Point group: D2
Chain length 466, copies 4
Amino acid sequence: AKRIVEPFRIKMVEKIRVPSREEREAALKEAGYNPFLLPSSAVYIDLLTDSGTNAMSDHQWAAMITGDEAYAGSRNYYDLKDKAKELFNYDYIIPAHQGRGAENILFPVLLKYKQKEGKAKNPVFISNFHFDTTAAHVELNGCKAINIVTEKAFDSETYDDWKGDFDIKKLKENIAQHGADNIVAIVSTVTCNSAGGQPVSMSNLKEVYEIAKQHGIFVVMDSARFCENAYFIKARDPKYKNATIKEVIFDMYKYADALTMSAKKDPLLNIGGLVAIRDNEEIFTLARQRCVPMEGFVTYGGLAGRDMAAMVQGLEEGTEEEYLHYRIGQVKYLGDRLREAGIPIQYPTGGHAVFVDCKKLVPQIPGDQFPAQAVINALYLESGVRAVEIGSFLLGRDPATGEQKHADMEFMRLTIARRVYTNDHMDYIADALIGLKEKFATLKGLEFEYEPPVLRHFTARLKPIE
Amino acid sequence: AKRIVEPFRIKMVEKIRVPSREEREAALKEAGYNPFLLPSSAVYIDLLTDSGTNAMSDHQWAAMITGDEAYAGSRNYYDLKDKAKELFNYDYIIPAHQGRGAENILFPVLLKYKQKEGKAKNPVFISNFHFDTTAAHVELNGCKAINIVTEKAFDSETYDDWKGDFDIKKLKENIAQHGADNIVAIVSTVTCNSAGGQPVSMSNLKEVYEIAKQHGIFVVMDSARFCENAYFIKARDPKYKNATIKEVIFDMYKYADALTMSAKKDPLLNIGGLVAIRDNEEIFTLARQRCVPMEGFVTYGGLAGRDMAAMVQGLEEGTEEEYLHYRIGQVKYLGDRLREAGIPIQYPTGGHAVFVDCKKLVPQIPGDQFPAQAVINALYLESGVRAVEIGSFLLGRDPATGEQKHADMEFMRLTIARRVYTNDHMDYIADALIGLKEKFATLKGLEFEYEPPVLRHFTARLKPIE
Amino acid sequence: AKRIVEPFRIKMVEKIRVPSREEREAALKEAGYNPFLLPSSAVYIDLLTDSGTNAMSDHQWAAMITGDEAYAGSRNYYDLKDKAKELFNYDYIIPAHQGRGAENILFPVLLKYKQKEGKAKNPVFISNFHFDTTAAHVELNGCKAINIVTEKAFDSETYDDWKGDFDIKKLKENIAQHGADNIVAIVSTVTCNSAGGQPVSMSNLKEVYEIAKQHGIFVVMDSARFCENAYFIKARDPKYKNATIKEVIFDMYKYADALTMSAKKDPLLNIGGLVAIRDNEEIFTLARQRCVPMEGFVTYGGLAGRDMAAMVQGLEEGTEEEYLHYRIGQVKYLGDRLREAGIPIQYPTGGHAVFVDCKKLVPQIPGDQFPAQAVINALYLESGVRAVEIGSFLLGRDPATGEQKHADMEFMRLTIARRVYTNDHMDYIADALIGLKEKFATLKGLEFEYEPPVLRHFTARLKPIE
Amino acid sequence: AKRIVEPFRIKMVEKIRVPSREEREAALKEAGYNPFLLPSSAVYIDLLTDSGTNAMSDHQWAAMITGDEAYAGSRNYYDLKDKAKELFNYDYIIPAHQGRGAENILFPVLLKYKQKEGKAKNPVFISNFHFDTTAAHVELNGCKAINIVTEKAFDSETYDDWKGDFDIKKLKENIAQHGADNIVAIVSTVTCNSAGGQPVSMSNLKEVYEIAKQHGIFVVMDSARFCENAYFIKARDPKYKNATIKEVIFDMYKYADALTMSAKKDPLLNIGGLVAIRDNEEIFTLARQRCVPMEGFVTYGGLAGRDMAAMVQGLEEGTEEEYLHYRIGQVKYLGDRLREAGIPIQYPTGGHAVFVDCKKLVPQIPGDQFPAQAVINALYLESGVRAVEIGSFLLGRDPATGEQKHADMEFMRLTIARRVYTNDHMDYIADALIGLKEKFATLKGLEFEYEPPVLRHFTARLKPIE
Ligand SMILES: CC1=C(O)/C(=C\N=C(/C[C@@]2(O)C(=O)Nc3ccccc32)C(=O)O)C(COP(=O)(O)O)=CN1
Ligand SMILES: CC1=C(O)/C(=C\N=C(/C[C@@]2(O)C(=O)Nc3ccccc32)C(=O)O)C(COP(=O)(O)O)=CN1
Ligand SMILES: CC1=C(O)/C(=C\N=C(/C[C@@]2(O)C(=O)Nc3ccccc32)C(=O)O)C(COP(=O)(O)O)=CN1
Ligand SMILES: CC1=C(O)/C(=C\N=C(/C[C@@]2(O)C(=O)Nc3ccccc32)C(=O)O)C(COP(=O)(O)O)=CN1
Ligand SMILES: [K+]
Ligand SMILES: [K+]
Ligand SMILES: [K+]
Ligand SMILES: [K+]
């Protein structure tokens, strides 16, 4: 395992503490064995998400201080519009308060646009993988969320350069089965969070856009982690070995028509989202009409002006190759430390997190009893580290069936916030999980005490099966 | 006209400038003669809204700096929960990214809950007045937005203590005509923004709640400007003459079952909203379930932790009577200067803005030609001051009939942000509008070039009728 | 009295509070009848000084948080160096923690340089007027501080354009009485703080520099309030009517060899000082060697990097004419309010304060009993406003005689911080002093209880004479 | 080598870059071969000092935002006075702008206080080791700075618990040779910066103070790194095995009569100093009288109010044992890395820096040619890391004879700012120095091209002896 040095130094700190063992068992029982319902004071190292937990730079905080809080026509809206034209070559922007606000603006608009000519009678969205809020909005509007990631992603131990690729054969077959008139949009998620933060090659993005253009289908790039995807393209595609990250990004977005971005990820923010549209003014105008009731006025979209200002600076900082090398290198370090102790992970590691394969760690727990969540409650009670489940729990139920959606992967996600923790924090995380090696076969399983009908893993209360 | 000194001193300033005459004219031509589409660099003193443009305290900024950005269980969430129990005596909270986000959480939940037993086939909301995003969410869910403000609000120059009161006769008549089973909720807006920021009395709120309780109708307090309402109750109600502001607030919220609040108004913020529920845990649970896909996890709701921290501090400062006396006194000063120079305004002034009655200022322009937007565009080209219209433009159209909603009031709103402008800024505003007295009769209305189907006045472009 | 509108708006506030009469009488008795020993919590509007109490912009705060805290070679040091070459055309800078730190760097070095040549056997400094720490440092190094302001500054109610001017006749007479070999340096104080913040004309600056260069006499421009001086030269000298503020400043500093600046005044800071030398690399090197033991390393000189960062931005903002017009106009507004009620002041008012002539207000109290302090303790006890004395109390004793220095002016200084208070605060201040007209003839002098031998007026405790 | 994890996480970052070898060589040549004259833009990792380069907490920044900037009686001044009563049991404080500002306040006052009644005719100060600026102020006031560190500090490789102790025998010898009447004060530097940041035992401080009280000698605690001293006492003295850090600090300061503190070190600040006095109100009053002309008014002392607020919070954080364990453990980690590779260091490592024994590393260079400054310049050209010399160069010359002061030590100080660099930065520094093994013997010393007479090493320009 190779440690990489920060291409920065620390300017401001916040204290963390280790709760006692007795505090963690009391708090986890009060939280219904769902770590989402734990207070942050009961958590030591928080690995629940990399969304909104990143450490900003001094330049970002300065941008916030001079941010323009005007209600209409803020100076930072025009800055954000210029930055999107620079990075993606897109001509239209609509800020949003975060990623699921961006999707709530754009996806209902695309569905109504597809219905203008009586089409979308049985509407579907096709993605390499819809993450949980993305699929939830697809389903909220009466559509089906179809995931066609390459089957290589389901083989954890088997290395592959692009475990986030669309299955091209499945794309053409889904287009054939449903019909181009039923596919409201194709959503390319970069990186593929559900596959393990695994990247999509430039050729896969290029071929998906060509097949979608052949059939007149709209393509949306889910751009939460597009810089980490761009970094992997430069690292693994020989064509881009000598290109800059901004050149990789600029070629990526030639293969989409619009983007929904959670700026709480690669732009290194605590809050923020973005819609951008390449050149379709009619879809832009319709998306603006929905932004107003749902998010806010079209030049702030539910964000304070200081946050747009921080987004303009974060969009720049998130593309710096030397930061990307350290960030993804750090995730790789935690992964190599866990692999060297024989703990199975999605190999190679992605950009933002290490995903532990809990199918292999605890095969006595059937997927419907959430094996990964068993390892999570175990890791927390042992160490004070809080992680999240990316498996049957998060996947929830089929809105049409009512039964469990089939899980091909049962991951425990060690999500790493950007510029927040050091490799010494990583050593605590790795050593903590490694210490449970003689206790995995003892882990039990979980059953619902209260289950929400949508996005159940966020607030469901669980009961141990013992 | 009585000037009231600031109960604070300035700690940080932000530069503003007067753009030239030819810059403003080109800008308004560029903005489709809609001030909303102007850039802030074309605006000198910005009176477009009191929402999100407030100036925070050093204590608020300090609270942001120690804000807890944790994804789940933020320390500042529990502070906000405690704060809402202190102010309102309400047991459950859900943060939202702003007011319309909070309405999107609760209003669809109340509609579904009311229909749980096959009832509410013709669902309606009843309010003294729904503001535009409030009525928009009522109508986006397929309900009718009924407004029954007191007739005394329609008599601008005639003083009345409570121009935001419900029409108790129209309330009982509407419960009879529609049936309690079709009334999803009664929404008490404090202060009544549409009537001119005019207050609702305690006994009016008390009687509406008791009427609703008799028929089992859920009551929501739209609480954007609830402190300004509490101040007026203390000033004008002899029952609360010797009571604290917080004692008045505690009583107000005995006459509701929940609130939706835009924290960008009286809590002195640049972003933020809040849902609070008194004691119905079932409504709270369903509202949580809708918060996750639309806004964020239930302990931040689309806000950074720093913004929840500011809200806890802002909720305290906004109740300070010394600040409230100065704030509402600054609004009263601006209106008195105009009223003394013969300019018709909603008398008495509201808490957050002076409302110039343009029907009596420009009688030549019919209501359907938006008489107040003529006065606003005239004021802007003259002084670099940008105002907003509250009349037929903002009312929009009846969604079922598709035609202009009848406007009883044609206001130009000079909206004053909290703790941002001095009384010398107020003198600049007043002198500008006074200098246009010889040109009012020459102004003409404006027709539509581009009209959105919902919330038109935000992005619509206008053609001045020559 | 004419109110001038702020060329900015408020971005952050700080709460102020009126202490009860009981709190003020107890506090002033506890403070030894010296308001300097009062706590800030016992003060309402603080008019003690305009030094270090100014409100910064959002740009200054933004500069601070990206400030470079490096011990040596901070990026902001070079920004500060370039700024002084832009503004003053000076080629060397040495930061200092504030004004008296800058004098301590340069004045002892000026004395040693003159002595290295066998001169300064009976050394003296000559100024239009040394302020108290300036005069104290000259005296601390064994020199006499001679003040030769124009006698027109002693006729307070008689208008004059340049009540800070040197007396060219006294300058020539002192050069002949002492000899150029005894004059260590001439210090030009702009604006002349002791004369009432009154300006020095360009031609007066030009004549003094030419007289000194004739005799090989080093000229230091004491520059705490150089921007306010530049404003008065543009306002009152026909040669500079169409010049910019920076063109006026650039000419001002052709008439000095160096400057000592308290940046806590016109550069709008809460801390900070500056030494800048025109082209004498020898004086620079000697001053660097004294900076190290007394202030810090030569590239920060007792300032954090963030404060040097705020100085680069504040230096620019301090020169802006629209700001200088409002600030100086606010001082005049307070003066005209007091004048219109018959209160005698140094007329015209200076750039940073209104100086109430207590020699004309309480003639029953002899100057040796500090009549201005009598008016001050009375104003504070009546209203919570804290002012400061500028007369025999501040003048102190002559080091040679040990007796009271002859005072030609007894002033109560109502010192106004920049961008902190509004004209409504000015109204409260004026109304408070006006309310004392009947009690002036009954006020009583003060006697020393404890008297420091240097700068007594800061920490001395006084007894009201019975 | 044992890595200790941070008891905090990163909240804000500042970018750092590695300059090209081309830039570095030009930068050092431009800087007269003195790294002090390097711009920070030519430095990668800056180990020049731990003074004022630390990283503050979010609580410290929040304290700055609400700092009270009042000129007299700032709320933060009283919080500081209370904090010093809490920590040290001292009744009087005077804030100072940094460490040498505190020395300039107190050392002249101690000299004049001792010279009452015509004694102290040959004044001396005695310390375990006066640091450079401390000895400079002793000598600037015409005194001798006698340094009597224990002989065990001169054996770098041989471990000792208390290498900063006073040589008690030499203290008694110097009291007899000079007489108790000529000793102005004994200065107890904790930790002993010159000995390598090495601690002073509690029994050493006790016996020094008791000996001083027998002779009526005043004792000043130089307190820049007093928390790091307090940690070592608890780590190494069995009597304080179960004591809190605050109990150790409270005991340490029973053995002084006053302190001079550079709050730029253990209080975790970027600027700030402090004088505190146990109970001598006469010294307090005399020291205040000097504070006013030299630093500023007594309640701020050349600091902004925000900086006093940060000091109140830093004085608490700097005592936290869990932070001290990490901080000193990190310095120890860098030392072990060097020691394991054969690099001679002062063993054991002290609190704030690794001191490399260059008397053993480059034996071919004599002390007159500054061997450590050749290793420093070589390390900078090799890697971009900037360190500082603590040997013959910093030692300077004897004021009485004018020749090089005899140096027992030739240290290259790798100085570690607090909470700024991760252990992966420590690895970079380590490998960079280890890679210079085959070049040490090849280096040669330096000679003066420009030498200042006071504190020469800050601004001297050197020439490499070829
Ligand atoms: C690819 C994509 C996302 O990964 C994505 C957000 N992912 C998150 C944040 C999140 O709350 C979530 O949504 N699900 C989930 C599951 C477990 C923990 C935390 C979370 C994440 O931690 O992986 C969004 C939504 O953006 P948004 O949060 O700004 O509204 C859209 N697209
Ligand atoms: C009583 C109530 C509100 O007054 C209210 C908001 N009022 C606003 C903000 C607003 O954008 C708007 O909505 N319409 C409108 C019309 C003209 C200018 C600006 C605006 C206002 O300035 O008048 C909300 C929604 O809150 P939200 O903005 O945080 O989402 C809910 N209830
Ligand atoms: C022309 C000039 C100055 O006016 C000046 C400072 N003036 C001050 C600040 C001051 O503390 C003071 O010194 N005396 C005094 C008397 C009453 C109240 C407050 C004060 C002021 O309020 O007028 C300096 C010193 O600079 P410094 O404060 O940064 O050290 C040098 N030159
Ligand atoms: C024990 C003690 C100190 O160590 C101490 C300061 N030490 C510093 C800062 C310093 O500039 C220095 O003075 N010499 C020196 C030598 C090399 C690099 C940097 C420096 C340090 O990095 O070691 C002070 C003075 O305090 P001050 O800096 O706030 O004025 C007093 N006592
Ligand atoms: K967050
Ligand atoms: K805003
Ligand atoms: K200050
Ligand atoms: K610093």
